[PDB]
Design a protein around this ligand. Structure first.
Ligand SMILES: NC(=O)C1=CN([C@@H]2O[C@H](COP(=O)(O)OP(=O)(O)OC[C@H]3O[C@@H](n4cnc5c(N)ncnc54)[C@H](O)[C@@H]3O)[C@@H](O)[C@H]2O)C=CC1
Ligand SMILES: NC(=O)C1=CN([C@@H]2O[C@H](COP(=O)(O)OP(=O)(O)OC[C@H]3O[C@@H](n4cnc5c(N)ncnc54)[C@H](O)[C@@H]3O)[C@@H](O)[C@H]2O)C=CC1
Lengths: 258, 258
């Protein structure tokens, strides 16, 4: 598996490091969970998909630390805070946070309601703020930390089909930069990690067809598949000591598309 | 030494890899040489500064491969190509290129002449194109490669004091993006690596005073010194297999300033 490929880096500073990943049960989040666990980190993740989450954690029980799973709905901030506190009691103070969960469900401009606007913000942006809010004091006490906010090239390409989603993901830029200014005095880096079109299992099974492949080939500079591992490795570097002075950045891993 | 600090990553794919660095005798270039040497790469570098270059190579003579040095003035394209060919004859096809050499000497708008304009472009931009031109066939034949072009945050901050330098450094964006598009079909990544104000020896002795220290602290999000190793570790990642789908980027390592 890509997270155990011997050609790729090993990051000694991740061993035993407490790492929290949201939306970790499937897709890129699952790749984050697997990569960090195989680096020796003490992983925990939250998600609504319990069956996928339990199977992921069981796959990774031979890691140095079996990943901790707590189920919660990230649109419920009280539940999110309760889950993080429960996680802290099991893995100790949080040293790295990957704000990954999202929902890119399509919506036409004419159909958006105030409630559906709010739901999109809640699932794509709001939880990134409150997850970070809940971990700052741990990272301050540790003498530093790393927060990785998942962005998107969707709004950079000016994709139609989901204008509130594009707004929510562009908003991550402002979130990252505002947190980076305030938290940098404490050794806390905050960065936006921006994926291109990643071939998650869901994207392969539901959305990749001939026109998709042709769009990828014309857009990307490199005619190859962007994989979850390409994003996971970048997150490892951003959470490791190796990137101590990288903060407030939009770190794009997309084959040269956007 | 930062390049041998056990807390940082080891990149297995760099072992034995032929890596060429321009302006590698001092400052950040020397840190590039040192880092790639300590990762086990087969390093070669060019520079005008022969005394510093021989000392740097001799000091790294206990690495897996002693870095190869060939002297040249990179503003002379024939000398640059000949130096690269001398290097190829010793370490074989080039797998990775770090285009680092530069000269940021200050100049009043009113004092620039046609010749002084051309020399600024020659030492700051032109050699990046031609060193890239001289390694592309190697990278094609190897099935891929990585070209790292050194940019600057100076033009991003709109610094006064050296307008042709600022032009040359902004020009690296177009160079990187144009090559990335043309060379991506061959598995060649091209990225701009953008340092902040890095505390090289030359920067401390010549440019860092109380004024500079105040600007750094107000500008950077993280109130700590940016060091050459911060940039070198990013270059290691960009040249290693771990960054196979990162191309056409402006990779900024600057403590959150620009
Ligand atoms: N081609 C791609 O996959 C793209 C990825 N991104 C971003 O990368 C990150 C992950 O991408 P994907 O894996 O493709 O997303 P995905 O939709 O396939 O998976 C999201 C995961 O978060 C969980 N999730 C969704 N809503 C939740 C909620 N209220 N509460 C708890 N968990 C919830 C989900 O169960 C899921 O496991 C996202 O932030 C996405 O916006 C953006 C650019 C392209
Ligand atoms: N150190 C900093 O604060 C910043 C660095 N940069 C960029 O990072 C890269 C390295 O920066 P520094 O180490 O500070 O530069 P530097 O001026 O201290 O060293 C440049 C090295 O290249 C060699 N060099 C200069 N002209 C040459 C020529 N015709 N022929 C052969 N060799 C030549 C020099 O001998 C030197 O060893 C540069 O491309 C620079 O523009 C940009 C942002 C700030």
């Amino acid at each position: 598996r890509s997270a155990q490929d011997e050609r790729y880096a090993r990051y000694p500073s991740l061993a035993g490091r407490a790492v929290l990943i949201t939306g970790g049960a499937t897709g890129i989040g699952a790749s984050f969970v697997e990569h960090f666990a195989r680096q020796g980190a003490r992983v925990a993740f939250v998600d609504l998909d319990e069956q996928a989450a339990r199977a992921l954690a069981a796959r990774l029980a031979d890691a140095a630390h079996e990943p901790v799973f707590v189920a919660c709905d990230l649109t419920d901030i009280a539940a999110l805070r309760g889950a993080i506190e429960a996680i802290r009691a099991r893995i100790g103070p949080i040293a790295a946070l990957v704000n990954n969960a999202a929902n890119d469900v399509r919506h036409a401009i004419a159909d958006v309601t105030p409630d559906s606007f709010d739901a999109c913000i809640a699932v794509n942006l709001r939880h990134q703020f409150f997850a970070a809010q809940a971990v700052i004091d741990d990272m301050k006490r540790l003498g530093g930390g790393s927060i990785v906010n998942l962005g998107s090239i969707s709004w950079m390409l000016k994709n139609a089909g989901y204008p509130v989603y594009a707004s929510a993901k562009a908003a991550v830029q402002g979130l990252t930069r505002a947190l980076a200014r305030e938290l940098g005095p404490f050794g806390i880096r905050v960065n936006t990690l921006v994926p291109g079109w990643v071939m998650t299992d869901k994207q392969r099974r539901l959305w990749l067809d001939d026109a998709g492949r042709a769009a990828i080939k014309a857009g990307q500079c490199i005619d190859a598949e962007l994989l979850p591992g390409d994003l996971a490795r970048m997150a490892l570097f951003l959470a490791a000591d190796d990137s101590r002075m990288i903060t407030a950045q939009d770190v794009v891993v997309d084959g040269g598309w956007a």
